Short mmCIF file of C-alpha atoms in Angstrom, two decimals:
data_model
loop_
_atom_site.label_atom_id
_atom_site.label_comp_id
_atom_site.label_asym_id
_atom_site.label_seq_id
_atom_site.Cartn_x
_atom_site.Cartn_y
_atom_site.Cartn_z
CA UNK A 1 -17.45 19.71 1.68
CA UNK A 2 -17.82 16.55 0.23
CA UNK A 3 -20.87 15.16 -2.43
CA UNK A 4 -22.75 12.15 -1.85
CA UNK A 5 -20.91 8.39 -2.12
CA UNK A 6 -17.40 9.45 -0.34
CA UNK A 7 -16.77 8.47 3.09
CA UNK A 8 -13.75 10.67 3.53
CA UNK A 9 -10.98 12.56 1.62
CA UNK A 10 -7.37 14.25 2.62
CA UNK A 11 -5.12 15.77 0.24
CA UNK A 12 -1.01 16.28 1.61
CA UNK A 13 2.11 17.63 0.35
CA UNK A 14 4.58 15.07 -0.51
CA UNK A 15 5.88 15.90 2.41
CA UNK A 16 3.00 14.93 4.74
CA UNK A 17 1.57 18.04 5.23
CA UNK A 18 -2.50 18.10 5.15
CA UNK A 19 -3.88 21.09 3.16
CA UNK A 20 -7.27 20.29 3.28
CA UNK A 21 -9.67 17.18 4.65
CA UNK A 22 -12.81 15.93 5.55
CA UNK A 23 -11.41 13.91 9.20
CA UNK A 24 -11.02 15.34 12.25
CA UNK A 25 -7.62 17.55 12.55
CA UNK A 26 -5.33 15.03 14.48
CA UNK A 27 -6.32 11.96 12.73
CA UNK A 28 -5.95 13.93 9.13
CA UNK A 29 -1.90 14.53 10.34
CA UNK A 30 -1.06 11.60 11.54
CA UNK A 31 -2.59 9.75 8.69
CA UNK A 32 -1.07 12.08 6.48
CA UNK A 33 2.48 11.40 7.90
CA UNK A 34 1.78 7.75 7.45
CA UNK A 35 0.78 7.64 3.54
CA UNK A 36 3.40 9.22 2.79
CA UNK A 37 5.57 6.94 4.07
CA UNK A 38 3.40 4.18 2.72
CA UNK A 39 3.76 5.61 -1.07
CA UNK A 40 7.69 5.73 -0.44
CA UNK A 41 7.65 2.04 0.35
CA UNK A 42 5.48 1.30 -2.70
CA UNK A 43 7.21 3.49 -4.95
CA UNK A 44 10.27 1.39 -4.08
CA UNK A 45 9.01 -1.63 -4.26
CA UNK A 46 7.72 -1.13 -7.44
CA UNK A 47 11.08 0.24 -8.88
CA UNK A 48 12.79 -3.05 -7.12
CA UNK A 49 10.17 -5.78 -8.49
CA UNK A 50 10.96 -3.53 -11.72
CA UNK A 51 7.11 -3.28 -12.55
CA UNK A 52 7.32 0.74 -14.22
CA UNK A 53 5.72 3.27 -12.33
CA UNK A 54 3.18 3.15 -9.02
CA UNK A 55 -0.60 4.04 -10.36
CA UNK A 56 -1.79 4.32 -7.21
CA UNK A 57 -2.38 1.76 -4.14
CA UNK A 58 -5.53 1.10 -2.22
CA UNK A 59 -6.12 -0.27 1.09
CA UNK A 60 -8.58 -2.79 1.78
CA UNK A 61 -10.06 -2.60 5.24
CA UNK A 62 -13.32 -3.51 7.38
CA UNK A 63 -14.96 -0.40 6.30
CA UNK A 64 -14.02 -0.64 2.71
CA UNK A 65 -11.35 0.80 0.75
CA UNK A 66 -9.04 3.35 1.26
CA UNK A 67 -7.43 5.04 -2.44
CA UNK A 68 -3.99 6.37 -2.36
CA UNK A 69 -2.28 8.41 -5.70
CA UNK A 70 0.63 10.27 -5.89
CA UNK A 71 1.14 13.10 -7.82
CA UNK A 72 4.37 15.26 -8.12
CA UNK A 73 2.98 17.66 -5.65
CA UNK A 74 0.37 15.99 -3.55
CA UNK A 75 -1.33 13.03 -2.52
CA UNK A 76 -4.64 12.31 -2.61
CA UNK A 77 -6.12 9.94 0.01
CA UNK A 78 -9.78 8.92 -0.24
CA UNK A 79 -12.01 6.74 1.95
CA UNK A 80 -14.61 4.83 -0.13
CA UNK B 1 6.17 -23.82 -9.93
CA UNK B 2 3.63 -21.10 -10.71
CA UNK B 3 -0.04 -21.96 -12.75
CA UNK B 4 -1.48 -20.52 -15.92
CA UNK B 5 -2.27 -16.90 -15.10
CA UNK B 6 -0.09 -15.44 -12.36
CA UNK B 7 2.76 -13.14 -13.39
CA UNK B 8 4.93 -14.18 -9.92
CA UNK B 9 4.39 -15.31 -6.52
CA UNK B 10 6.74 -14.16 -3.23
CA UNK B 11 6.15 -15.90 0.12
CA UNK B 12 7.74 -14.08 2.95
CA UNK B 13 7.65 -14.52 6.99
CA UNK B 14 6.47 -11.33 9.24
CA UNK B 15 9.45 -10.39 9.17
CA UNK B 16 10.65 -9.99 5.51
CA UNK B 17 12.06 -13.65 5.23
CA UNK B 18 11.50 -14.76 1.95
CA UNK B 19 10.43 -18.87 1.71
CA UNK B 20 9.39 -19.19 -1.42
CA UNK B 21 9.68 -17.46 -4.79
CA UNK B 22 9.17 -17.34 -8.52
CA UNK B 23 11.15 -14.30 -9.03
CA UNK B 24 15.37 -13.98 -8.68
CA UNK B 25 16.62 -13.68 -5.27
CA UNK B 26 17.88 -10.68 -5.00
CA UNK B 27 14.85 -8.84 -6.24
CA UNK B 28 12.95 -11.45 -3.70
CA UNK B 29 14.72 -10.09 -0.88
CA UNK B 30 14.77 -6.91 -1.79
CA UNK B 31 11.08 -6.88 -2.39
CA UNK B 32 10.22 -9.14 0.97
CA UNK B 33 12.14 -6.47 2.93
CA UNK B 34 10.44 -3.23 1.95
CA UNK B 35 7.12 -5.13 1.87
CA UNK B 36 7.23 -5.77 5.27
CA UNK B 37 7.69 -1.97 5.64
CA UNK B 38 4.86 -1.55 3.62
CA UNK B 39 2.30 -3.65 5.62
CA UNK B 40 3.87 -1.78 8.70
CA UNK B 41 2.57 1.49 7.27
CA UNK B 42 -0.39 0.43 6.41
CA UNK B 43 -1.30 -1.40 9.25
CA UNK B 44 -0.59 2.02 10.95
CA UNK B 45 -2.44 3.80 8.40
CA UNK B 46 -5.97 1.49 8.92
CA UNK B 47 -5.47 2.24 12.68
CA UNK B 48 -4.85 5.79 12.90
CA UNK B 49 -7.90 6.32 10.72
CA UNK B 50 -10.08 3.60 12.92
CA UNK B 51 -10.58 1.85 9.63
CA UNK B 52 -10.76 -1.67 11.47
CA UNK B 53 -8.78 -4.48 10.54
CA UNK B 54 -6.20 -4.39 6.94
CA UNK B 55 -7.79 -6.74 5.13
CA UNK B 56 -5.14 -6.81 2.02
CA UNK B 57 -3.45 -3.77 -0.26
CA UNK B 58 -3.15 -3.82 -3.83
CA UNK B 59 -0.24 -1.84 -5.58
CA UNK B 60 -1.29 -0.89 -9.16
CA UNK B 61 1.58 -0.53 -11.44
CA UNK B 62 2.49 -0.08 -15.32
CA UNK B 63 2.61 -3.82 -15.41
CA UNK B 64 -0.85 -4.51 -13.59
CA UNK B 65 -1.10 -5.04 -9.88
CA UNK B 66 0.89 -6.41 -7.04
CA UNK B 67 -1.56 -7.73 -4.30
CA UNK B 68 -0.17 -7.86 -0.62
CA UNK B 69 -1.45 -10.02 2.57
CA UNK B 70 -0.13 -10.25 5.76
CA UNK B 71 -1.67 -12.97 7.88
CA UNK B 72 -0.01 -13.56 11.50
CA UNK B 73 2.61 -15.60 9.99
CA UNK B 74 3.48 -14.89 6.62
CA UNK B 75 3.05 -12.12 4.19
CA UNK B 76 1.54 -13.22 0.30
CA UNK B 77 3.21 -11.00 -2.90
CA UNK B 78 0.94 -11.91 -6.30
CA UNK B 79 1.49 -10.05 -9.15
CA UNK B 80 -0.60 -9.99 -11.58
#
């Protein structure tokens, strides 16, 4: 259950695998499969343009923004 | 030639071509290619959660932030 001001959240394994969300079952996987292939690419593009470590990432889109952090252990994805 | 402000600029085709650069090549074309795969993802990402259109992405790093857009053309790299 989510408060009021979020549109959506989903938090993954670093290996893709959803253990909890706010979206629809299908959609929650497949996005979940695609972050994390997202962070890889901007984990290594930040170790190749040399600029430290990846914060996080966000996604600007039609509907607004869409917040993407790694931890060690799981990534947190949330629509806002 | 890069103004007062910006910490580097890569200009890159659709297809991870770099034209244009204020960085060394090899991190250029390093960077340009897993950009590219970076867009890719999250192009995928905005679609599989029926987020509309990707408007732009923004990495944020230890350094400060790495803003990506892909129009049909060419893909913009600005860090700053």
């Amino acid at each position: 259950q989510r408060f009021e001001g979020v549109r959506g959240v989903i938090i993954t394994t670093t290996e893709g695998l959803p253990i909890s969300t706010t979206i629809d079952r299908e959609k929650t996987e497949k996005t979940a499969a695609l972050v994390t292939s997202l962070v890889g690419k901007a984990r290594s593009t930040v170790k190749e343009l040399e600029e430290g470590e990846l914060k996080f990432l966000t996604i600007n889109t039609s509907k607004g923004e869409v917040h993407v952090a790694q931890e060690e252990d799981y990534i947190l994805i949330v629509l806002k």
